[PDB]
């Protein structure tokens, strides 16, 4: 049974230098990104006007073609420029700068991993991105910038060719993940450490990646609960730092001795985004 400091010592001695990371929405809540399932935020109020039978309908294709306005309300909120990366993103940024990051697999669509400075080659946006869009009728591709004006003006973007609805390349339920997700067949056999930050692992096939690392590879989970196949199929080197994600990260950063270097990185990265 390993501890949090044991995983930290392995990283300090470069015993684990091919880390794959799996992150979910829990790492972006500190940035102020609201959970549209609970009242309070202006996003929730702007989504109340639409008769959503359940919050997950916003990522379902049948409801999207019934009424795409709820989705583009979320798209307008999550389009780049509204939110900044938080300390958890920059810890992963520092991990890449020190040459320890093999790949970052994210379920999030806020694009904050790219904003933090992690190159696209190191990133697998497994649930899509707002950086590109596709016409639902004629499959014509579009840069995300070409529909930004319509999205910001609360207009459902239409295809200039066939007038079909142009949908951002966000992976809806029932759709296969982007082709870049197939990098897991190469990355996960190669990983020597698996970090799982801020996710409940309720969505497949992303959740089952935790069991794709080899048997001797430790799996560090920083989350408020023990979730997913880490609870029914735990392994001998599984480490679970239960609690607040940010507190778990800044605890690991302190055990690594990166606290001062991390803060200097954040202030220079945050200020440049102004």
């Amino acid at each position: 049974k390993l501890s949090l400091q044991d995983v930290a010592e392995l990283i300090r001695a470069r015993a684990c230098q091919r880390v794959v990371v799996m992150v979910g929405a829990g790492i972006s809540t500190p940035s102020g990104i609201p959970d549209f399932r609970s009242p309070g935020s202006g996003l929730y109020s702007n989504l109340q006007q639409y008769d959503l039978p359940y919050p997950e309908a916003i990522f379902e294709l049948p409801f999207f073609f019934h009424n795409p306005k709820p989705f583009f309300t979320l798209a307008k909120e999550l389009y780049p420029g509204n939110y900044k990366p938080n300390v958890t993103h920059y810890f992963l940024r520092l991990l890449h700068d020190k040459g320890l990051l093999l790949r970052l697999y994210t379920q999030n669509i806020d694009g904050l991993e790219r904003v933090s400075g992690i190159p696209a080659s190191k990133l697998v946006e497994a649930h899509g991105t707002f950086a590109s869009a596709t016409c639902t009728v004629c499959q014509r591709p579009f840069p995300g910038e070409d529909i930004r004006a319509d999205v910001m003006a609360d207009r459902v973007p239409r295809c200039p060719v066939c007038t079909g609805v142009v949908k951002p390349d966000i992976v809806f339920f029932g759709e296969p993940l982007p082709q870049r997700f197939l990098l897991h067949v190469v990355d996960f056999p190669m990983a020597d450490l698996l970090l799982i930050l801020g996710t409940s692992l309720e969505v497949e096939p992303f959740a089952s990646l935790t069991e794709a690392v080899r048997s001797s590879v430790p799996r560090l989970l920083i989350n408020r609960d023990l979730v997913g196949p880490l609870a029914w199929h735990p392994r001998s080197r599984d480490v679970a730092q239960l609690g607040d994600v940010v507190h778990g990260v800044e605890s690991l950063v302190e055990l690594l001795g990166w606290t001062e270097e991390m803060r200097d990185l954040v202030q220079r990265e945050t200020g440049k985004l102004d």
């Binding site: 339920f173 309720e202 497949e204 992303f206």
Partner: peptide
């Protein structure tokens, strides 16, 4: 990939 398919919701909780 060994039968990796659509984006789908899981179970076994709550």
């Amino acid at each position: 990939g060994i039968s990796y398919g659509r984006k789908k919701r899981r179970q076994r909780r709550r």
